[PDB]
Design a protein around this nucleic acid. Structure first.
Ligand SMILES: [Zn+2]
Lengths: 177, 93, 99, 181, 72, 121, 107
RNA sequence: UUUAUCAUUGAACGUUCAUUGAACAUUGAUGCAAACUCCUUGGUCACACACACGCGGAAGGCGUGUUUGCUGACGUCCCUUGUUUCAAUCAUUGGUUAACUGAUUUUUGGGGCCCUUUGUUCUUCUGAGAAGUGACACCAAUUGGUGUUAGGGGAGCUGGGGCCUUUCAAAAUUUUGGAAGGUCUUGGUCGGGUGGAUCUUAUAAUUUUUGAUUUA
């Protein structure tokens, strides 16, 4: 009878198909849902392995090296920096070929994301219900943009660089703009 | 009612599953909606015939009692359905 | 007969250790005792062909560390059965053992 | 590099520096043991910090090369994509492309220069600058002398001023001694 | 107990694979709680074609799967 | 496999064990059962599915057997097309560890209910 | 009136089981389920003279090295075709069915 | 080792070529191995290194005892957490004739092992110390969600087992049972239209258990 929703920790007083569909599409359910799945992954990534590490029993140990610890504030800071950087490296994709093929005859059928025919009917159907208040499509041909360097496009963006090694670049480029 | 596994299949909605059928066909695609009776509806389906070919359905609806198994994604390994001790917040009255 | 040493006493109780020694040495007598004195020590007993196989040795055990061979100080009982009286000798040895 | 620096930071059991690079060349050039009977904490931390110097110097070389490629050439290339043989291409654009073709010739990494001649051949497609540039490249430097015939055919296949390419095609095949062709 | 969710396929040309090599194409006129299926203009496709009369109804035991040939 | 399976245990006691469930086809699924039901629909974590080929079946006749494994991971197998299940590996954590873990899970659950009672106030 | 209850009187009894496949199974019953999922410890199981699906289903169950000796086999009910009881057992004792008796007194 | 479409028409001597129409992969696939490299796990325990014929771990079986006939939800203190061993100093307690021996605690120092404790350690802070046992940690937009709050040792108390002593009963000095004390070892610190679990019944008719997977 009762449908317990483990995420929402609420009940449905009598199970049927329509209250299930309407609940699983419900924005409250999706929010608590997404919080939970993110939460399980960040727990499992956070959780240290802590293996048994069965220590064996063993002259040539003459060299001794200095360990490097950090302050508890310094520990917490560098861990926060690493958290932010993991979160960047997972999320970031590479644009380029979108920005590269901007003027193209069939850019607006192929890279404009639901004119592709293959994934195309998804993004229309995957559009959320838009009950609250408040596209470059196939019509584009060659003669829309005849001459791309008439109406100024922005240049190719300068490539990105690690700030950890940003100090070690070539100073003083040849050929000033 | 349901029991744990078909509750899991009710959980993995809209995510890339792979079905073998009893014929040996292994459909694969996004899972539109499963029912309690394991009739499952799928989208962007890529199909492997028993002969070894591959094709692409858009929109399939495979009946439950010819499913051989279904593979959901990995993360549902960690799911609140599996929690053996989660206590019930005072069922309705 | 030949007694081998450093043969990993925590391998098994009786017969699985006789299988694991015969497997890494792929013989008619492989005596291994569970007593605390004879622990990492065993005795195989085939005598001249056994002396040839002991002269063949470099042998390591299936649990690990290398096994040292050596010749038996007196004999195994199977060698005394090959030389065959003997029941009286077993009785005398048991009478010395209980003493 | 960020993926691989992160990947260096994650490795901690010190035996998978073997699967990082070859054990022997990790010993001889860089002086780390993988077999080590010690406390292995500061040893691993010294190992990681010592490897970050090698990735510095690799990052220096390839960062210098890419900042060169960018600042000289790709800052002046705007169009990559072959619109429609009606459309024309700027003179300063051609000026960048032919230098970039010239540039890659000196590197001699053949896959890169096959790629860059074919790659510039997209928006340049049929001006008969790049095709002739290719053929005179292959005859001169690489010396196949038949591949130049082949690409030269393939740009007779479209380059609207076909005159120069038909004359050069004639001469190449006269060298080839395919007279029936 | 639950009636199936073929409501999206309500008038759209579907292709059953029936039983393992039977393939029948029609328009989904009806469905019950067992996936017994009423098709209109059934046209059995062999890999040759064979038409199957005006209306037909196909056992929900024999039905393995069905594809929407029509766009949705 | 000398695993010595519990002589008085059925499915619910077999939880988190590594199974080797076998089907009508003769395919084998190998993995941790994490759940079953009345109809014997199993989930199977990290599952690998092995067949023998038709050709290797000749060698299987009255030995080294090139079983073909595909990796199905978290799968959820059905009670219609199976035959029988056995047990292949014991779980990771022992009976004391499982027992202390269940104690901690129950304490955390009671605590979450205390927090529900606090938020309800 | 169901006869699974009969089998429920048979914990720690040594039977054989022939399956719908053709697999033959030897080893004691530890229990039996409502719909006859019979769990069996100390199995060794055999395939009489052959069925290729049964050959695969035999070998793949571990410890084959064609008698396969297995510690513990759950068997699904719709696989059990027939089950051979020990002949030492007296059927006159077991079929009495205290539930059926009580139902006769319930009438 | 094998395989890499069919149909129709024309031509040449079943084959080859051409045209037309219809519908993954050869570096594969299958068989036989063999070797290297790599991966994860485990008491790399305690004892000992020798000439026979140990405690605490993990998994199962059997026996005894208690408790309940389903389960649980709803309406103690202190010390330490790098460890271990050795010497010295001091305190207390016991014995023997101020001296000696033993035990415990504190301090100092040395040796070994280990620090992958990878963030150099139950949580926070500082560069081992300090504080705490609702707090902390963190992701989304003050709110919501998940995890953690530990481990070891000792004492008090309590449960169980084993031994010994005493008393009482029964049977023919012995056996059994009960009680008490001491010693050792191990463990801990009433209701309910509530839900869940198991089993019955709908339920042997198309969807998992009352058969269409021995390929005839
Ligand atoms: Zn919900």
């Amino acid at each position: 009878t009762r449908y317990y929703c483990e995420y929402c920790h609420s009940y449905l007083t009598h199970d049927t198909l329509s209250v299930r569909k309407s609940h699983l599409v419900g924005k409250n359910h999706l929010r608590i849902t997404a919080d939970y799945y993110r939460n399980k992954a960040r727990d499992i990534i956070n959780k240290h392995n802590h293996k048994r590490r069965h220590i064996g029993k063993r002259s040539s140990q003459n060299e001794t090296l200095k360990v490097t610890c950090l302050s508890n504030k310094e520990k917490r800071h560098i861990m926060h920096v690493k958290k932010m950087n993991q979160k960047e490296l997972a999320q970031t994709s590479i644009d380029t070929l979108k920005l590269l093929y901007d003027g193209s005859p069939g850019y607006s059928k192929v890279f404009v994301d639901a004119n592709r025919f293959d994934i195309g009917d998804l993004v229309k159907a995957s559009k959320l219900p838009q009950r609250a208040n408040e596209s470059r499509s196939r019509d584009e041909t060659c003669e829309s943009n005849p001459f791309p360097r008439l109406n100024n496009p922005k240049k190719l963006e300068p490539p990105k660089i690690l700030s950890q090694w940003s100090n070690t670049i070539p100073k003083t480029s040849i050929f000033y703009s | 009612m349901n029991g744990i596994p078909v509750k899991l299949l009710n959980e993995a909605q809209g995510h890339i599953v792979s079905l073998e059928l009893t014929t040996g066909a292994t459909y694969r695609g996004k899972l539109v909606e499963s029912e309690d009776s394991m009739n499952v509806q799928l989208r962007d389906v890529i199909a492997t015939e028993p002969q070894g070919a591959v094709t692409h359905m858009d929109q399939i609806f495979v009946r439950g009692s010819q499913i051989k198994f279904i593979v959901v994604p990995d993360l549902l390994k960690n799911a609140p359905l599996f929690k053996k001790n989660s206590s019930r917040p005072m069922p309705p009255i | 007969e030949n007694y081998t040493r450093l043969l990993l006493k925590h391998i098994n109780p009786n017969n699985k250790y006789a299988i694991n020694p015969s497997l890494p040495l792929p013989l008619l007598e492989v005596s291994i005792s569970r007593s605390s004195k004879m622990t990492n020590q065993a005795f195989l007993t085939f005598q001249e062909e056994a002396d040839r196989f002991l002269e063949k040795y470099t042998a390591l055990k299936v649990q690990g560390r290398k096994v040292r061979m050596g010749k038996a100080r007196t004999n195994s009982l199977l060698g005394x059965x090959x030389x065959x009286x003997x029941x009286x000798x077993x009785x005398x040895x048991x009478x010395x053992x209980x003493x | 590099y960020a993926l691989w620096l992160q990947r260096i930071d994650d490795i901690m059991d010190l035996k998978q520096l073997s699967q990082l690079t070859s054990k022997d060349e990790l010993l001889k050039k860089l002086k780390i043991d993988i077999n080590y009977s010690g406390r292995k904490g500061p040893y691993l931390q010294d190992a990681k910090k010592k490897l970050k110097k090698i990735t510095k110097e690799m990052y220096m070389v390839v960062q210098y090369q890419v900042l060169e490629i960018y600042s000289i050439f790709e800052s002046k290339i705007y169009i990559n994509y072959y619109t429609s043989p009606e459309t024309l291409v700027s003179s300063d654009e051609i000026e960048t492309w032919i230098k970039y073709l010239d540039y890659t010739i000196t590197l001699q990494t053949d896959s890169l220069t096959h790629l860059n001649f074919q790659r510039a051949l997209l928006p340049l497609a049929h001006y008969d600058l790049v095709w002739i540039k290719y053929s005179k490249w292959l005859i001169n430097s690489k010396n196949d002398l038949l591949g130049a015939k082949n690409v030269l055919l393939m740009g007779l296949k479209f380059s609207l001023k076909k005159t120069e390419i038909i004359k050069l095609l004639y001469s190449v095949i006269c060298k080839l001694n395919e007279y029936v062709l | 107990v639950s009636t199936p969710e073929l409501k999206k396929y309500m008038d759209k040309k579907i292709l059953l694979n029936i039983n393992g090599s039977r393939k029948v194409a029609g328009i989904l006129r009806g469905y019950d709680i067992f996936l017994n299926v009423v098709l209109d203009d059934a046209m059995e496709i062999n890999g040759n074609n064979h038409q199957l009369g005006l209306q037909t109804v196909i056992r929900g035991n024999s039905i393995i799967s069905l594809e929407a040939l029509d766009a949705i | 496999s000398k695993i010595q399976v519990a002589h008085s245990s059925r499915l619910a006691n077999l939880i988190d064990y590594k199974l080797r469930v076998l089907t009508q086809d003769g395919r084998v699924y190998i993995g941790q059962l994490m759940a079953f039901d009345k109809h014997m629909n199993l989930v199977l974590n990290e599952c690998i599915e092995e067949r023998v080929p038709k050709t290797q079946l000749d060698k299987l006749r009255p030995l080294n057997i090139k079983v073909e494994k595909r990796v199905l991971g978290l799968t959820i197998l059905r009670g219609e097309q199976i035959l029988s299940t056995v047990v292949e590996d014991k779980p990771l954590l022992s009976k004391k560890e499982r027992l202390v873990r269940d104690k901690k899970e129950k304490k955390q659950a009671q605590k979450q209910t205390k927090l529900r009672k606090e938020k309800e106030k | 009136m169901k006869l699974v209850n009969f089998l429920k009187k048979l914990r720690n009894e040594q039977v054989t089981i022939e399956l719908k496949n053709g697999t033959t199974v030897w080893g004691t019953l530890q229990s039996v389920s409502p719909q006859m999922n019979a769990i069996l410890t100390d199995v060794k199981l055999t395939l009489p003279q052959s069925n290729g699906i049964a050959m695969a289903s035999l070998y793949l169950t571990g410890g084959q090295q064609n008698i396969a000796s297995l510690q513990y086999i759950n068997i699904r009910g719709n696989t059990i075709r027939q089950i051979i009881l020990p002949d030492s057992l007296n059927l006159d004792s077991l079929l009495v069915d205290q539930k059926q008796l009580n139902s006769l007194r319930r009438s």
